[PDB]
PDB file of all heavy atoms in Angstrom:
ATOM      1  N   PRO A   1      25.980  -5.356 -10.333  1.00  0.00           N
ATOM      2  CA  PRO A   1      24.827  -4.928 -11.155  1.00  0.00           C
ATOM      3  C   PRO A   1      24.410  -3.501 -10.831  1.00  0.00           C
ATOM      4  O   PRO A   1      24.907  -2.897  -9.881  1.00  0.00           O
ATOM      5  CB  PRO A   1      23.689  -5.884 -10.841  1.00  0.00           C
ATOM      6  CG  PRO A   1      24.023  -6.266  -9.405  1.00  0.00           C
ATOM      7  CD  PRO A   1      25.554  -6.413  -9.398  1.00  0.00           C
ATOM      8  N   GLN A   2      23.504  -2.968 -11.642  1.00  0.00           N
ATOM      9  CA  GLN A   2      22.978  -1.630 -11.428  1.00  0.00           C
ATOM     10  C   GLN A   2      21.498  -1.826 -11.146  1.00  0.00           C
ATOM     11  O   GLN A   2      20.774  -2.401 -11.958  1.00  0.00           O
ATOM     12  CB  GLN A   2      23.157  -0.752 -12.663  1.00  0.00           C
ATOM     13  CG  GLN A   2      22.663   0.670 -12.452  1.00  0.00           C
ATOM     14  CD  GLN A   2      22.937   1.574 -13.634  1.00  0.00           C
ATOM     15  OE1 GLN A   2      22.365   1.399 -14.711  1.00  0.00           O
ATOM     16  NE2 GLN A   2      23.817   2.550 -13.439  1.00  0.00           N
ATOM     17  N   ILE A   3      21.056  -1.352  -9.991  1.00  0.00           N
ATOM     18  CA  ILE A   3      19.672  -1.505  -9.588  1.00  0.00           C
ATOM     19  C   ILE A   3      18.926  -0.184  -9.653  1.00  0.00           C
ATOM     20  O   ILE A   3      19.335   0.794  -9.034  1.00  0.00           O
ATOM     21  CB  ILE A   3      19.601  -2.069  -8.155  1.00  0.00           C
ATOM     22  CG1 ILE A   3      20.366  -3.395  -8.095  1.00  0.00           C
ATOM     23  CG2 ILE A   3      18.153  -2.273  -7.731  1.00  0.00           C
ATOM     24  CD1 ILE A   3      20.509  -3.966  -6.703  1.00  0.00           C
ATOM     25  N   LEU A   5      15.507   2.256  -9.097  1.00  0.00           N
ATOM     26  CA  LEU A   5      14.630   2.395  -7.947  1.00  0.00           C
ATOM     27  C   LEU A   5      13.147   2.577  -8.260  1.00  0.00           C
ATOM     28  O   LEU A   5      12.391   3.119  -7.452  1.00  0.00           O
ATOM     29  CB  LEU A   5      15.152   3.537  -7.070  1.00  0.00           C
ATOM     30  CG  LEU A   5      16.578   3.270  -6.567  1.00  0.00           C
ATOM     31  CD1 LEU A   5      17.150   4.498  -5.870  1.00  0.00           C
ATOM     32  CD2 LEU A   5      16.550   2.074  -5.623  1.00  0.00           C
ATOM     33  N   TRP A   6      12.728   2.108  -9.431  1.00  0.00           N
ATOM     34  CA  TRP A   6      11.326   2.199  -9.816  1.00  0.00           C
ATOM     35  C   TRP A   6      10.521   1.324  -8.860  1.00  0.00           C
ATOM     36  O   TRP A   6       9.372   1.623  -8.543  1.00  0.00           O
ATOM     37  CB  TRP A   6      11.141   1.721 -11.258  1.00  0.00           C
ATOM     38  CG  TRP A   6      11.883   2.555 -12.259  1.00  0.00           C
ATOM     39  CD1 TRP A   6      12.941   2.165 -13.032  1.00  0.00           C
ATOM     40  CD2 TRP A   6      11.605   3.915 -12.616  1.00  0.00           C
ATOM     41  NE1 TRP A   6      13.336   3.198 -13.852  1.00  0.00           N
ATOM     42  CE2 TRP A   6      12.532   4.282 -13.618  1.00  0.00           C
ATOM     43  CE3 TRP A   6      10.659   4.857 -12.191  1.00  0.00           C
ATOM     44  CZ2 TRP A   6      12.541   5.555 -14.202  1.00  0.00           C
ATOM     45  CZ3 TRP A   6      10.668   6.122 -12.773  1.00  0.00           C
ATOM     46  CH2 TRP A   6      11.604   6.457 -13.767  1.00  0.00           C
ATOM     47  N   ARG A   8      10.958  -1.401  -5.204  1.00  0.00           N
ATOM     48  CA  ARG A   8      11.801  -1.599  -4.033  1.00  0.00           C
ATOM     49  C   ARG A   8      12.977  -2.469  -4.434  1.00  0.00           C
ATOM     50  O   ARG A   8      12.812  -3.462  -5.150  1.00  0.00           O
ATOM     51  CB  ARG A   8      11.014  -2.281  -2.918  1.00  0.00           C
ATOM     52  CG  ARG A   8       9.928  -1.416  -2.326  1.00  0.00           C
ATOM     53  CD  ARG A   8       9.239  -2.125  -1.179  1.00  0.00           C
ATOM     54  NE  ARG A   8       8.362  -1.221  -0.446  1.00  0.00           N
ATOM     55  CZ  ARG A   8       7.699  -1.555   0.653  1.00  0.00           C
ATOM     56  NH1 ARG A   8       7.810  -2.781   1.152  1.00  0.00           N
ATOM     57  NH2 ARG A   8       6.925  -0.662   1.257  1.00  0.00           N
ATOM     58  N   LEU A  24      17.607  -3.571   0.047  1.00  0.00           N
ATOM     59  CA  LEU A  24      18.881  -2.848   0.111  1.00  0.00           C
ATOM     60  C   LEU A  24      18.430  -1.470   0.571  1.00  0.00           C
ATOM     61  O   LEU A  24      17.808  -0.718  -0.179  1.00  0.00           O
ATOM     62  CB  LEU A  24      19.540  -2.777  -1.270  1.00  0.00           C
ATOM     63  CG  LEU A  24      19.903  -4.144  -1.857  1.00  0.00           C
ATOM     64  CD1 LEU A  24      20.558  -3.961  -3.211  1.00  0.00           C
ATOM     65  CD2 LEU A  24      20.842  -4.884  -0.907  1.00  0.00           C
ATOM     66  N   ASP A  25      18.758  -1.146   1.814  1.00  0.00           N
ATOM     67  CA  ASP A  25      18.282   0.083   2.430  1.00  0.00           C
ATOM     68  C   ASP A  25      19.377   1.060   2.828  1.00  0.00           C
ATOM     69  O   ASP A  25      19.975   0.901   3.881  1.00  0.00           O
ATOM     70  CB  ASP A  25      17.483  -0.330   3.665  1.00  0.00           C
ATOM     71  CG  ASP A  25      16.615   0.778   4.206  1.00  0.00           C
ATOM     72  OD1 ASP A  25      16.889   1.956   3.910  1.00  0.00           O
ATOM     73  OD2 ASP A  25      15.663   0.450   4.941  1.00  0.00           O
ATOM     74  N   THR A  26      19.619   2.085   2.012  1.00  0.00           N
ATOM     75  CA  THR A  26      20.664   3.058   2.333  1.00  0.00           C
ATOM     76  C   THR A  26      20.301   3.938   3.519  1.00  0.00           C
ATOM     77  O   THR A  26      21.172   4.588   4.105  1.00  0.00           O
ATOM     78  CB  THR A  26      20.991   3.968   1.130  1.00  0.00           C
ATOM     79  OG1 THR A  26      19.813   4.677   0.716  1.00  0.00           O
ATOM     80  CG2 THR A  26      21.523   3.131  -0.024  1.00  0.00           C
ATOM     81  N   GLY A  27      19.019   3.954   3.872  1.00  0.00           N
ATOM     82  CA  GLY A  27      18.570   4.756   5.000  1.00  0.00           C
ATOM     83  C   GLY A  27      18.685   4.025   6.328  1.00  0.00           C
ATOM     84  O   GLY A  27      18.396   4.590   7.383  1.00  0.00           O
ATOM     85  N   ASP A  29      21.044   2.278   9.099  1.00  0.00           N
ATOM     86  CA  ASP A  29      22.431   2.230   9.544  1.00  0.00           C
ATOM     87  C   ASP A  29      22.890   0.789   9.683  1.00  0.00           C
ATOM     88  O   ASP A  29      24.022   0.444   9.344  1.00  0.00           O
ATOM     89  CB  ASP A  29      22.599   2.920  10.896  1.00  0.00           C
ATOM     90  CG  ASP A  29      22.308   4.397  10.832  1.00  0.00           C
ATOM     91  OD1 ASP A  29      22.591   5.017   9.791  1.00  0.00           O
ATOM     92  OD2 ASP A  29      21.810   4.938  11.834  1.00  0.00           O
ATOM     93  N   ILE A  50      10.961   5.411  11.483  1.00  0.00           N
ATOM     94  CA  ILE A  50       9.652   6.027  11.394  1.00  0.00           C
ATOM     95  C   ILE A  50       8.699   5.183  12.239  1.00  0.00           C
ATOM     96  O   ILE A  50       8.667   3.961  12.109  1.00  0.00           O
ATOM     97  CB  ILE A  50       9.129   6.052   9.942  1.00  0.00           C
ATOM     98  CG1 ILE A  50       9.914   7.074   9.116  1.00  0.00           C
ATOM     99  CG2 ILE A  50       7.648   6.392   9.930  1.00  0.00           C
ATOM    100  CD1 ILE A  50      11.196   6.539   8.559  1.00  0.00           C
ATOM    101  N   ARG A  87      23.537  -0.149   5.810  1.00  0.00           N
ATOM    102  CA  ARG A  87      24.864   0.306   5.430  1.00  0.00           C
ATOM    103  C   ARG A  87      26.029  -0.524   5.943  1.00  0.00           C
ATOM    104  O   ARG A  87      27.033  -0.661   5.243  1.00  0.00           O
ATOM    105  CB  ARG A  87      25.058   1.769   5.849  1.00  0.00           C
ATOM    106  CG  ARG A  87      24.144   2.734   5.102  1.00  0.00           C
ATOM    107  CD  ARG A  87      24.547   4.189   5.316  1.00  0.00           C
ATOM    108  NE  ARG A  87      24.448   4.579   6.719  1.00  0.00           N
ATOM    109  CZ  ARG A  87      25.475   4.636   7.565  1.00  0.00           C
ATOM    110  NH1 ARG A  87      26.701   4.333   7.159  1.00  0.00           N
ATOM    111  NH2 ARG A  87      25.270   4.984   8.829  1.00  0.00           N
ATOM    112  N   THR A  91      28.265  -1.575   2.550  1.00  0.00           N
ATOM    113  CA  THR A  91      29.632  -1.128   2.290  1.00  0.00           C
ATOM    114  C   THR A  91      30.534  -2.302   1.939  1.00  0.00           C
ATOM    115  O   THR A  91      31.407  -2.191   1.076  1.00  0.00           O
ATOM    116  CB  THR A  91      30.252  -0.413   3.514  1.00  0.00           C
ATOM    117  OG1 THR A  91      30.199  -1.281   4.655  1.00  0.00           O
ATOM    118  CG2 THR A  91      29.510   0.884   3.819  1.00  0.00           C
ATOM    119  N   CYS A  95      28.581  -1.460  -2.438  1.00  0.00           N
ATOM    120  CA  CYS A  95      27.397  -0.806  -2.969  1.00  0.00           C
ATOM    121  C   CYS A  95      27.494   0.710  -2.845  1.00  0.00           C
ATOM    122  O   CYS A  95      27.860   1.232  -1.795  1.00  0.00           O
ATOM    123  CB  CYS A  95      26.163  -1.316  -2.224  1.00  0.00           C
ATOM    124  SG  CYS A  95      24.607  -0.697  -2.875  1.00  0.00           S
ATOM    125  N   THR A  96      27.165   1.416  -3.924  1.00  0.00           N
ATOM    126  CA  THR A  96      27.198   2.875  -3.918  1.00  0.00           C
ATOM    127  C   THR A  96      25.934   3.434  -4.562  1.00  0.00           C
ATOM    128  O   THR A  96      25.239   2.728  -5.295  1.00  0.00           O
ATOM    129  CB  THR A  96      28.395   3.419  -4.719  1.00  0.00           C
ATOM    130  OG1 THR A  96      28.282   3.003  -6.086  1.00  0.00           O
ATOM    131  CG2 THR A  96      29.706   2.911  -4.138  1.00  0.00           C
ATOM    132  N   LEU A  97      25.636   4.698  -4.266  1.00  0.00           N
ATOM    133  CA  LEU A  97      24.490   5.384  -4.857  1.00  0.00           C
ATOM    134  C   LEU A  97      25.093   6.236  -5.955  1.00  0.00           C
ATOM    135  O   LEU A  97      26.092   6.917  -5.731  1.00  0.00           O
ATOM    136  CB  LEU A  97      23.803   6.300  -3.842  1.00  0.00           C
ATOM    137  CG  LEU A  97      22.923   5.633  -2.788  1.00  0.00           C
ATOM    138  CD1 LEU A  97      23.696   4.534  -2.086  1.00  0.00           C
ATOM    139  CD2 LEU A  97      22.461   6.681  -1.790  1.00  0.00           C
ATOM    140  N   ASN A  98      24.495   6.197  -7.138  1.00  0.00           N
ATOM    141  CA  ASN A  98      25.015   6.971  -8.253  1.00  0.00           C
ATOM    142  C   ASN A  98      23.932   7.715  -9.015  1.00  0.00           C
ATOM    143  O   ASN A  98      22.847   7.187  -9.243  1.00  0.00           O
ATOM    144  CB  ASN A  98      25.751   6.056  -9.232  1.00  0.00           C
ATOM    145  CG  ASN A  98      26.891   5.305  -8.584  1.00  0.00           C
ATOM    146  OD1 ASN A  98      26.684   4.314  -7.883  1.00  0.00           O
ATOM    147  ND2 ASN A  98      28.106   5.779  -8.810  1.00  0.00           N
ATOM    148  N   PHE A  99      24.251   8.946  -9.405  1.00  0.00           N
ATOM    149  CA  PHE A  99      23.352   9.789 -10.181  1.00  0.00           C
ATOM    150  C   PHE A  99      24.144  10.966 -10.742  1.00  0.00           C
ATOM    151  O   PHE A  99      23.528  11.871 -11.339  1.00  0.00           O
ATOM    152  CB  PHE A  99      22.182  10.302  -9.327  1.00  0.00           C
ATOM    153  CG  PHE A  99      22.594  11.172  -8.171  1.00  0.00           C
ATOM    154  CD1 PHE A  99      22.523  12.558  -8.269  1.00  0.00           C
ATOM    155  CD2 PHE A  99      23.036  10.608  -6.979  1.00  0.00           C
ATOM    156  CE1 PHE A  99      22.883  13.369  -7.197  1.00  0.00           C
ATOM    157  CE2 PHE A  99      23.398  11.410  -5.900  1.00  0.00           C
ATOM    158  CZ  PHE A  99      23.322  12.792  -6.007  1.00  0.00           C
TER     159      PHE A  99
ATOM    160  N   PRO B   1      27.285  12.177  -9.285  1.00  0.00           N
ATOM    161  CA  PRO B   1      28.303  11.798  -8.283  1.00  0.00           C
ATOM    162  C   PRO B   1      28.065  10.386  -7.771  1.00  0.00           C
ATOM    163  O   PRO B   1      26.978   9.831  -7.936  1.00  0.00           O
ATOM    164  CB  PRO B   1      28.180  12.794  -7.145  1.00  0.00           C
ATOM    165  CG  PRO B   1      26.698  13.116  -7.210  1.00  0.00           C
ATOM    166  CD  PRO B   1      26.400  13.210  -8.719  1.00  0.00           C
ATOM    167  N   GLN B   2      29.093   9.807  -7.161  1.00  0.00           N
ATOM    168  CA  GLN B   2      29.000   8.470  -6.593  1.00  0.00           C
ATOM    169  C   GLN B   2      29.149   8.616  -5.089  1.00  0.00           C
ATOM    170  O   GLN B   2      30.132   9.179  -4.604  1.00  0.00           O
ATOM    171  CB  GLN B   2      30.101   7.562  -7.142  1.00  0.00           C
ATOM    172  CG  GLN B   2      30.243   6.253  -6.380  1.00  0.00           C
ATOM    173  CD  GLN B   2      31.170   5.277  -7.067  1.00  0.00           C
ATOM    174  OE1 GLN B   2      30.822   4.686  -8.091  1.00  0.00           O
ATOM    175  NE2 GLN B   2      32.365   5.105  -6.513  1.00  0.00           N
ATOM    176  N   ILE B   3      28.166   8.113  -4.353  1.00  0.00           N
ATOM    177  CA  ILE B   3      28.170   8.210  -2.904  1.00  0.00           C
ATOM    178  C   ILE B   3      28.351   6.847  -2.246  1.00  0.00           C
ATOM    179  O   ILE B   3      27.589   5.918  -2.507  1.00  0.00           O
ATOM    180  CB  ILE B   3      26.850   8.845  -2.407  1.00  0.00           C
ATOM    181  CG1 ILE B   3      26.696  10.240  -3.020  1.00  0.00           C
ATOM    182  CG2 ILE B   3      26.831   8.912  -0.883  1.00  0.00           C
ATOM    183  CD1 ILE B   3      25.412  10.945  -2.645  1.00  0.00           C
ATOM    184  N   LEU B   5      28.707   4.375   1.249  1.00  0.00           N
ATOM    185  CA  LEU B   5      27.830   4.278   2.400  1.00  0.00           C
ATOM    186  C   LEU B   5      28.513   4.064   3.747  1.00  0.00           C
ATOM    187  O   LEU B   5      27.904   3.553   4.688  1.00  0.00           O
ATOM    188  CB  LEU B   5      26.817   3.167   2.130  1.00  0.00           C
ATOM    189  CG  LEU B   5      26.030   3.390   0.835  1.00  0.00           C
ATOM    190  CD1 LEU B   5      25.251   2.138   0.472  1.00  0.00           C
ATOM    191  CD2 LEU B   5      25.098   4.584   1.011  1.00  0.00           C
ATOM    192  N   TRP B   6      29.774   4.469   3.851  1.00  0.00           N
ATOM    193  CA  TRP B   6      30.494   4.319   5.108  1.00  0.00           C
ATOM    194  C   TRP B   6      29.876   5.247   6.146  1.00  0.00           C
ATOM    195  O   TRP B   6      29.975   5.015   7.346  1.00  0.00           O
ATOM    196  CB  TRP B   6      31.973   4.623   4.894  1.00  0.00           C
ATOM    197  CG  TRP B   6      32.544   3.725   3.861  1.00  0.00           C
ATOM    198  CD1 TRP B   6      32.727   4.003   2.539  1.00  0.00           C
ATOM    199  CD2 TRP B   6      32.925   2.357   4.042  1.00  0.00           C
ATOM    200  NE1 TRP B   6      33.197   2.891   1.880  1.00  0.00           N
ATOM    201  CE2 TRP B   6      33.327   1.865   2.780  1.00  0.00           C
ATOM    202  CE3 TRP B   6      32.965   1.497   5.149  1.00  0.00           C
ATOM    203  CZ2 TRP B   6      33.763   0.551   2.592  1.00  0.00           C
ATOM    204  CZ3 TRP B   6      33.401   0.186   4.961  1.00  0.00           C
ATOM    205  CH2 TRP B   6      33.793  -0.271   3.691  1.00  0.00           C
ATOM    206  N   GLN B   7      29.236   6.305   5.666  1.00  0.00           N
ATOM    207  CA  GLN B   7      28.544   7.247   6.530  1.00  0.00           C
ATOM    208  C   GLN B   7      27.164   7.422   5.906  1.00  0.00           C
ATOM    209  O   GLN B   7      26.927   6.964   4.791  1.00  0.00           O
ATOM    210  CB  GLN B   7      29.283   8.588   6.582  1.00  0.00           C
ATOM    211  CG  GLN B   7      29.593   9.190   5.225  1.00  0.00           C
ATOM    212  CD  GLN B   7      30.407  10.470   5.327  1.00  0.00           C
ATOM    213  OE1 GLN B   7      29.925  11.491   5.822  1.00  0.00           O
ATOM    214  NE2 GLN B   7      31.651  10.417   4.863  1.00  0.00           N
ATOM    215  N   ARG B   8      26.248   8.056   6.622  1.00  0.00           N
ATOM    216  CA  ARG B   8      24.911   8.260   6.075  1.00  0.00           C
ATOM    217  C   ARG B   8      24.979   9.100   4.812  1.00  0.00           C
ATOM    218  O   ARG B   8      25.717  10.085   4.743  1.00  0.00           O
ATOM    219  CB  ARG B   8      24.014   8.955   7.093  1.00  0.00           C
ATOM    220  CG  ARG B   8      23.606   8.067   8.243  1.00  0.00           C
ATOM    221  CD  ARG B   8      22.645   8.791   9.162  1.00  0.00           C
ATOM    222  NE  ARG B   8      22.152   7.912  10.215  1.00  0.00           N
ATOM    223  CZ  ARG B   8      21.289   8.284  11.154  1.00  0.00           C
ATOM    224  NH1 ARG B   8      20.822   9.527  11.172  1.00  0.00           N
ATOM    225  NH2 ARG B   8      20.887   7.413  12.071  1.00  0.00           N
ATOM    226  N   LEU B  24      19.405  10.217   1.515  1.00  0.00           N
ATOM    227  CA  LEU B  24      19.004   9.532   0.291  1.00  0.00           C
ATOM    228  C   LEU B  24      18.688   8.122   0.778  1.00  0.00           C
ATOM    229  O   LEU B  24      19.588   7.359   1.130  1.00  0.00           O
ATOM    230  CB  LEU B  24      20.153   9.511  -0.711  1.00  0.00           C
ATOM    231  CG  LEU B  24      20.645  10.874  -1.206  1.00  0.00           C
ATOM    232  CD1 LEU B  24      21.693  10.643  -2.281  1.00  0.00           C
ATOM    233  CD2 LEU B  24      19.486  11.702  -1.760  1.00  0.00           C
ATOM    234  N   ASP B  25      17.408   7.775   0.781  1.00  0.00           N
ATOM    235  CA  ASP B  25      16.975   6.496   1.323  1.00  0.00           C
ATOM    236  C   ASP B  25      16.292   5.557   0.339  1.00  0.00           C
ATOM    237  O   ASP B  25      15.116   5.727   0.034  1.00  0.00           O
ATOM    238  CB  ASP B  25      16.037   6.785   2.496  1.00  0.00           C
ATOM    239  CG  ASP B  25      15.715   5.553   3.306  1.00  0.00           C
ATOM    240  OD1 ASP B  25      16.096   4.439   2.887  1.00  0.00           O
ATOM    241  OD2 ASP B  25      15.077   5.714   4.360  1.00  0.00           O
ATOM    242  N   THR B  26      17.024   4.552  -0.138  1.00  0.00           N
ATOM    243  CA  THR B  26      16.459   3.598  -1.080  1.00  0.00           C
ATOM    244  C   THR B  26      15.390   2.732  -0.423  1.00  0.00           C
ATOM    245  O   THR B  26      14.587   2.107  -1.114  1.00  0.00           O
ATOM    246  CB  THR B  26      17.543   2.677  -1.672  1.00  0.00           C
ATOM    247  OG1 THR B  26      18.231   2.003  -0.612  1.00  0.00           O
ATOM    248  CG2 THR B  26      18.540   3.490  -2.482  1.00  0.00           C
ATOM    249  N   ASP B  29       9.798   4.410   0.283  1.00  0.00           N
ATOM    250  CA  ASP B  29       9.013   4.494  -0.947  1.00  0.00           C
ATOM    251  C   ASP B  29       8.746   5.945  -1.303  1.00  0.00           C
ATOM    252  O   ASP B  29       8.745   6.324  -2.476  1.00  0.00           O
ATOM    253  CB  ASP B  29       7.655   3.811  -0.790  1.00  0.00           C
ATOM    254  CG  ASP B  29       7.768   2.337  -0.493  1.00  0.00           C
ATOM    255  OD1 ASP B  29       8.719   1.700  -0.982  1.00  0.00           O
ATOM    256  OD2 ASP B  29       6.887   1.814   0.219  1.00  0.00           O
ATOM    257  N   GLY B  49       6.871   2.559   9.111  1.00  0.00           N
ATOM    258  CA  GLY B  49       8.309   2.391   9.149  1.00  0.00           C
ATOM    259  C   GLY B  49       8.663   1.219  10.039  1.00  0.00           C
ATOM    260  O   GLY B  49       7.814   0.390  10.364  1.00  0.00           O
ATOM    261  N   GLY B  51       9.254   1.116  13.195  1.00  0.00           N
ATOM    262  CA  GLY B  51       8.597   1.099  14.494  1.00  0.00           C
ATOM    263  C   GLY B  51       7.089   1.281  14.518  1.00  0.00           C
ATOM    264  O   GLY B  51       6.488   1.355  15.589  1.00  0.00           O
ATOM    265  N   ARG B  87      12.325   6.870  -2.906  1.00  0.00           N
ATOM    266  CA  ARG B  87      12.376   6.440  -4.292  1.00  0.00           C
ATOM    267  C   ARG B  87      11.589   7.291  -5.271  1.00  0.00           C
ATOM    268  O   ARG B  87      11.997   7.421  -6.418  1.00  0.00           O
ATOM    269  CB  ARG B  87      11.947   4.971  -4.405  1.00  0.00           C
ATOM    270  CG  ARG B  87      12.940   4.006  -3.760  1.00  0.00           C
ATOM    271  CD  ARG B  87      12.612   2.540  -4.053  1.00  0.00           C
ATOM    272  NE  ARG B  87      11.280   2.174  -3.579  1.00  0.00           N
ATOM    273  CZ  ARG B  87      10.202   2.112  -4.354  1.00  0.00           C
ATOM    274  NH1 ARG B  87      10.293   2.381  -5.650  1.00  0.00           N
ATOM    275  NH2 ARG B  87       9.028   1.798  -3.827  1.00  0.00           N
ATOM    276  N   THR B  91      14.220   8.431  -8.226  1.00  0.00           N
ATOM    277  CA  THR B  91      14.076   8.050  -9.628  1.00  0.00           C
ATOM    278  C   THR B  91      14.104   9.275 -10.530  1.00  0.00           C
ATOM    279  O   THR B  91      14.574   9.207 -11.667  1.00  0.00           O
ATOM    280  CB  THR B  91      12.762   7.289  -9.875  1.00  0.00           C
ATOM    281  OG1 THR B  91      11.673   8.023  -9.306  1.00  0.00           O
ATOM    282  CG2 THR B  91      12.825   5.900  -9.251  1.00  0.00           C
ATOM    283  N   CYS B  95      18.878   8.257  -9.802  1.00  0.00           N
ATOM    284  CA  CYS B  95      19.715   7.571  -8.830  1.00  0.00           C
ATOM    285  C   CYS B  95      19.566   6.055  -8.913  1.00  0.00           C
ATOM    286  O   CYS B  95      18.455   5.531  -9.021  1.00  0.00           O
ATOM    287  CB  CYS B  95      19.356   8.051  -7.420  1.00  0.00           C
ATOM    288  SG  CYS B  95      20.463   7.453  -6.141  1.00  0.00           S
ATOM    289  N   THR B  96      20.694   5.355  -8.878  1.00  0.00           N
ATOM    290  CA  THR B  96      20.688   3.900  -8.918  1.00  0.00           C
ATOM    291  C   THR B  96      21.653   3.353  -7.884  1.00  0.00           C
ATOM    292  O   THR B  96      22.540   4.061  -7.416  1.00  0.00           O
ATOM    293  CB  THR B  96      21.135   3.349 -10.294  1.00  0.00           C
ATOM    294  OG1 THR B  96      22.460   3.809 -10.585  1.00  0.00           O
ATOM    295  CG2 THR B  96      20.179   3.798 -11.391  1.00  0.00           C
ATOM    296  N   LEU B  97      21.457   2.092  -7.521  1.00  0.00           N
ATOM    297  CA  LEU B  97      22.331   1.404  -6.582  1.00  0.00           C
ATOM    298  C   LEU B  97      23.263   0.580  -7.452  1.00  0.00           C
ATOM    299  O   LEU B  97      22.814  -0.062  -8.400  1.00  0.00           O
ATOM    300  CB  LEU B  97      21.531   0.475  -5.675  1.00  0.00           C
ATOM    301  CG  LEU B  97      20.838   1.121  -4.481  1.00  0.00           C
ATOM    302  CD1 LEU B  97      19.976   0.091  -3.785  1.00  0.00           C
ATOM    303  CD2 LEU B  97      21.885   1.667  -3.524  1.00  0.00           C
ATOM    304  N   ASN B  98      24.552   0.595  -7.130  1.00  0.00           N
ATOM    305  CA  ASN B  98      25.539  -0.138  -7.915  1.00  0.00           C
ATOM    306  C   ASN B  98      26.547  -0.904  -7.071  1.00  0.00           C
ATOM    307  O   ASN B  98      26.962  -0.443  -6.013  1.00  0.00           O
ATOM    308  CB  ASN B  98      26.295   0.839  -8.816  1.00  0.00           C
ATOM    309  CG  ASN B  98      25.385   1.525  -9.810  1.00  0.00           C
ATOM    310  OD1 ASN B  98      25.142   1.012 -10.901  1.00  0.00           O
ATOM    311  ND2 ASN B  98      24.861   2.681  -9.428  1.00  0.00           N
ATOM    312  N   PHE B  99      26.937  -2.078  -7.558  1.00  0.00           N
ATOM    313  CA  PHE B  99      27.927  -2.906  -6.879  1.00  0.00           C
ATOM    314  C   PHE B  99      28.343  -4.075  -7.768  1.00  0.00           C
ATOM    315  O   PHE B  99      29.403  -4.677  -7.506  1.00  0.00           O
ATOM    316  CB  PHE B  99      27.397  -3.401  -5.522  1.00  0.00           C
ATOM    317  CG  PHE B  99      26.231  -4.350  -5.614  1.00  0.00           C
ATOM    318  CD1 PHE B  99      26.430  -5.698  -5.889  1.00  0.00           C
ATOM    319  CD2 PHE B  99      24.934  -3.899  -5.383  1.00  0.00           C
ATOM    320  CE1 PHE B  99      25.356  -6.587  -5.928  1.00  0.00           C
ATOM    321  CE2 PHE B  99      23.853  -4.779  -5.420  1.00  0.00           C
ATOM    322  CZ  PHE B  99      24.065  -6.125  -5.692  1.00  0.00           C
TER     323      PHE B  99
END
Side-chain angles (χ1 to χ4, degrees):
Chain A
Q2 182 175 67
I3 303 173
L5 300 172
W6 298 113
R8 292 183 170 184
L24 298 181
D25 196 339
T26 59
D29 295 326
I50 288 84
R87 294 192 298 99
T91 56
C95 185
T96 61
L97 284 52
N98 302 78
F99 62 99
Chain B
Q2 168 171 287
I3 301 178
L5 304 169
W6 302 97
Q7 52 184 293
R8 288 184 175 181
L24 298 185
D25 190 352
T26 57
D29 298 327
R87 292 188 301 99
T91 50
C95 188
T96 59
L97 279 174
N98 298 273
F99 66 81

